[PDB]
Design a binder for these strands. Structure first.
Lengths: 173, 88
RNA sequence: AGCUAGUUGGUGGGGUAAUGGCCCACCAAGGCGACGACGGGUAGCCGGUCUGAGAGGAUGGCCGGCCACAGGGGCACUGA
RNA sequence: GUGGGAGAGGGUGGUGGAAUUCCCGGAGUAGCGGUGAAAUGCGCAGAUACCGGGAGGAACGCCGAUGGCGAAGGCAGCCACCUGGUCCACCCGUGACGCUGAGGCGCGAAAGCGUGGGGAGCAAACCGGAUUAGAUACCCGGGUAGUCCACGCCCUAAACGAUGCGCGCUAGGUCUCUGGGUCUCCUGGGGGCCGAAGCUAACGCGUUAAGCGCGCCGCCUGGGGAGUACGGCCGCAAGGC
RNA sequence: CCGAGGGUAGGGCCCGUGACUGGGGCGAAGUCGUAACAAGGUAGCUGUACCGGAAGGUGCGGCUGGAUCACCUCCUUU
RNA sequence: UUCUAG
RNA sequence: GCGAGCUAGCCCUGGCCAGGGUGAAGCUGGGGUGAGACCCAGUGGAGGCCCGAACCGGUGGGGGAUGCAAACCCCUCGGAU
RNA sequence: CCGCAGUGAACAGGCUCUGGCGACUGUUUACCAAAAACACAGCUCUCUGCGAACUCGUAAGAGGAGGUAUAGGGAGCGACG
RNA sequence: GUCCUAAGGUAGCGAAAUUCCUUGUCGGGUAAGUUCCGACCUGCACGAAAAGCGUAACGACCGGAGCGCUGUCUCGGCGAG
């Protein structure tokens, strides 16, 4: 419903309980309200799995318990993640419903290796974080916009195209 | 899997007479039990087509034993079906 | 490879020598089929006839029985 | 029933080296690689070979076998999870509960298609090099779809033992595996080989029958046109019945 | 009311039938090539896929109705 | 590599 | 310098589409198999979906040409959650 | 029972057979042209790892996008087969 | 058999809205048909990506034909405002 919310933990020792299935319409991410100890909440990432009955978190410590997330430092090798913590705390550093996250495919000193979900590879840094678990996007692909144009229903630009025009109009155009 | 003491509590359950180690009452009870944790196994493991075919033989083994008891005494056949719960 | 509206049965009833959905009313819907129904192709069916070691193949014009048609298509009369 | 036993039957997850090709560093030359002999090709921007490191699929050497499992196709590095079939011994339990099976219903090589990953190597197509008369093929150097997996679709084939299933009767010698026994051998299953009776037109089958008898099945019935045309069912189509 | 017959329309089963075109069979014999039986010269046949004046070829699978010792590993036994 | 039919 | 009370857009915030028709997901029940596939029947009510007012339009013909008018009148037509 | 007529008047598809292009509802050249023109749902190459890449901007800055490679921009075709 | 080129048009299609010689030649439709529609195909100059062959439904799109029906027409002739 035209809004944002959470995207980056950094208060820990906190109790992570899988709020609920609030599959969400606004970023290809499907998240559920994450119930913290105090009671303070957050429509959190959609890293598939972690059943309703919440039951997680993270921590400077550890707990690969699927989903969840800590610094690079605190992370296995051969592991699949998201909550792409690029720079030191820059919260998320990639993978948006981009299921196929990154896989600490080898780390090095204040530098941890990452399979570039998108489609390449290089390294991050020290404390830098990132929570494993999948994504959530049920292949959020495909699906037919049949005899109409989902598009429009887009609210998402018919910013339509052209290219053939009659003129000689717009940038590199 | 099927436990050995589970098998006996089933054999004891269905026996009309203390010592019924093999009879219509036991066969069907065995085969039906073997039918419900083999089919349960095939729902996950979608493609176990070798053990599915070996199940279907056993499916046909049941029915023919069932056939016999209706052929002789359909009175205890209505008692055997309801108790188990097969046919619909 | 599906077939069916008089179609399957019933109540009453017309008509007929009189049975019968045979024709009609009203009622409920069933009746059929691979143990080949519906459709298509073709046809006079038999006693007998020709052949055959035979079982079985063919065939059934004149003599005989039952049947059909009277140029094609129907209907009624008189009337046992 | 019970009590053992074997196996690459299956399907889910997981790990294990061996090497393969690409990538970063070391070292270190001038040639490599390749055939019937060459050539195309790589390489002085330093390749091939060796050292070390990496990443990645994909199979799975020796054991492994003329051996094993399985309904058919077909199935092999170890792991555990569900699970099928199938075999000796006790002779305990039911009590003829059976044997065949139109149609169906399910499986089911490999090619292929549908979408979604992945692509080390192999490899039609296509590309060069050779070749001869000619080279659209053999031979050499490249390389794409596929081959890989999930999921759904095709179901065809020298799908082979070219040979339905069941039981029961008719000498044997011999190799091997599995299960039991008084375990110099007898026993029940299973696999290879020789060989009496017998069948055969011919080879050859021969208690693993192509012998002798009983059920129930499918298929035959001159060669081409044909396994095709037409009607019908089925597939996204290539086709397929 | 039922109905012989006549009409307009709609479909179904079939015979004829056509420019043209796919193939199939004959026919003295024609051209171009070697596919096939001796490893027919690359052994052949096959499901399929692509490609090639044409026989065919190459790939994935396989069946031998494939066979020699022109070579290796050994096997199996007195 | 090819060389008809009787 | 001057302008989106022209018009093309874009942001924010309200209002508006008389009636009718077609009948997919679903859920209920029944249906030969192990569960099912899956069938059917009921309910059900989607779709830039159909038939059409207002409303949006302005092909196809008619008039008009110092018009009613610097684009309008007439018959006609498309769209119609 | 009645008239030539019984939606009696009034509002109310002519249908069919075929072909070509573009699939389709559309959108557009206000005052000629609504079309085989653009638009598309859909495909393919593709630049981009963020403080993105391209667009405005004299330097800030906004956009992008509080998006983050099932994504954002560049594109030639424009179901599906 | 060759001379040149980087190879030197492949599958589908074809007088198509790319074919002027042309109302091309054969076929059907007709009392005759230079429009159509099928087929050949010597494609004056199609062709796979500004896709290529086809394609149910879909179109105020364009072109071809049949019934149904009417002053559109065989000259109309009357009338109402």
């Amino acid at each position: 419903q035209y809004r944002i919310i959470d995207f980056k933990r950094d208060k820990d020792g906190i109790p992570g309980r899988v709020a609920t299935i609030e599959y969400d319409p606004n970023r290809s991410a499907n998240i559920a309200l994450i119930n913290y100890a105090d009671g303070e909440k957050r429509y959190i990432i959609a890293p598939k799995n972690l059943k309703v009955g919440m039951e997680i978190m993270s921590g400077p410590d550890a707990d690969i318990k699927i989903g969840n997330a800590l610094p690079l430092e605190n992370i296995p090798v051969g592991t699949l993640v998201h909550n792409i913590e690029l720079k030191p705390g820059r919260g998320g550093q990639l993978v948006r419903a981009a299921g196929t996250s990154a896989q600490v495919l080898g780390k090095e000193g204040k530098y941890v290796i990452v399979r570039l979900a998108s489609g390449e590879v290089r390294m991050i840094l020290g404390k830098c974080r990132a929570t494993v678990g999948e994504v959530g996007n049920g292949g959020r692909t495909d699906k037919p916009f049949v005899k109409a144009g989902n598009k429009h229903h887009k609210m998402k630009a018919p910013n339509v195209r052209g290219v053939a025009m009659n003129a000689v109009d717009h940038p590199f155009g | 899997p099927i436990t050995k003491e589970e098998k006996q509590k089933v054999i004891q359950e269905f026996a009309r007479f203390p010592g019924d180690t093999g009879s219509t009452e036991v066969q069907v009870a065995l085969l039906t039990l073997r039918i419900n944790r083999l089919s349960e196994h095939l729902k996950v493991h979608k493609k176990d087509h070798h053990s599915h075919r070996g199940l279907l033989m056993m499916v046909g083994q049941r029915r023919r034993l069932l056939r016999y008891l209706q052929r002789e005494d359909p009175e205890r056949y209505r008692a055997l079906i309801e108790k188990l719960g097969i046919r619909g």
